[PDB]
């Protein structure tokens, strides 16, 4: 038999709309949602990180029956307000975006005065849990960078440590969140071929950013963030259908 048939269409059961779009796992999502039933009136916070091919999006979401209520929100293109104009997909940007969302959340609570988080890298803060982010997990992924930034920001997101370098290494993480690895690759690329360097990092040059400057700019930005958070109708179709059938016969 041919593949596509009326019985097959009638029988076929659709998958959920967001899963069709590609966004939601559901199996992870329900576990992320569901509180212990006897522990009623407490709703598990999701720290949402979705990595778009242009900038990363960090949200605090709280699940409710008519859908998730969004408490805090940060996008990388807010970092522009904090003087960061390029590198929006970057590990360093993700850390900052995470730090910014946490700071905005803390400001909203007013809990910022109680918990500032730790200024600069090597009673209790609110607990929240990292979203699925639909990514195959890796050391140094941007979701982990955002979680680290959010934690350093102030959140108590519980986590393992081997999705950062040194499976722990603090220096490699520090270089990653600074953007030192980008800087070294820029210098290396300039050494290799300067046309190839310019053709690659076009935006950074327009902005007037050298490799040296990136770590300093990120440090200034972190301090700044901390300081300052058609359709037709049936009658019409009948008329049109009649005319096209007649017309095609009359023409041909």
């Amino acid at each position: 038999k041919v593949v596509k048939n009326k019985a097959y269409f009638k029988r076929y059961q659709v998958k959920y709309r967001r899963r069709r779009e590609g966004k939601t796992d559901y199996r992870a999502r329900k576990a992320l949602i569901l509180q212990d039933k006897n522990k009623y009136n407490a709703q598990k916070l999701r720290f949402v990180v979705r990595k778009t091919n242009s900038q990363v999006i960090c949200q605090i979401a709280c699940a409710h029956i008519e859908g998730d209520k969004i408490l805090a929100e940060a996008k990388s293109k807010e970092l522009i307000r904090y003087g960061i104009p390029v590198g929006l997909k970057n590990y360093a940007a993700a850390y900052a975006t995470g730090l910014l969302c946490a700071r905005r959340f803390l400001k909203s609570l007013n809990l910022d005065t109680q918990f500032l988080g730790v200024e600069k890298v090597t009673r209790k803060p609110i607990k929240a849990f990292l979203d699925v982010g639909i990514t195959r997990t890796t050391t140094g992924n941007r979701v982990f960078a955002a979680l680290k930034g959010a934690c350093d920001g102030g959140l108590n997101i519980p986590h393992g440590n081997n999705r950062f370098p040194g499976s722990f290494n603090p220096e490699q993480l520090r270089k990653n969140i600074l953007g030192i690895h980008v800087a070294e690759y820029m210098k290396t690329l300039q050494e290799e071929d300067n046309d190839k360097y310019k053709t690659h990092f076009n935006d950074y040059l327009k902005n007037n950013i050298g490799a040296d400057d990136i770590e300093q700019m990120y440090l200034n930005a972190h301090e700044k963030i901390r300081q300052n958070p058609k359709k037709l109708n049936a009658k019409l179709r009948k008329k049109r259908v009649k005319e096209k059938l007649a017309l095609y016969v009359e023409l041909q």
């Binding site: 329900k30 039933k37 009136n41 699940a63």
Partner: protein
Amino acid sequence: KSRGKRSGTRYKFSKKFRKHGECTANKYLEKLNYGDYVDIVCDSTQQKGMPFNYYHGKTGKIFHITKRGVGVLVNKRVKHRIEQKKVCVRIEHVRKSRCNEDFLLRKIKNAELIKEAKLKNEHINIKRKTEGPKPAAMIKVPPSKIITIEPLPFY
């Protein structure tokens, strides 16, 4: 003859059509209290905590809640006596009951009515009274626009 746990459930524990696979998370999020009435209605996907045949579609009070379990006191007829039996069921199988929700709505409307009646100083009768009393009534159809009917003949 044999009498194992799922004995005689081929039709009963079948899926309904177009309802196959795991069901929405937002079913599980539903909030339950001690002393709620709750229906026991079972999706067939999740196999742990599945109650016995008799308790399907039954209703009873929640007396205990656990991590993903709910204790429900359900009545069972055992020959010459009904007794209350402690059916442990899952978040998956609990449905919030609706008889209580009619009582709640009824109470709410009655309370507003009671407030109004007290404010106006005139008695009311709450009672969900009889069906059967009909007042006198009029037909205004034109006298030759009425439908004339007769029996139906054969093939």
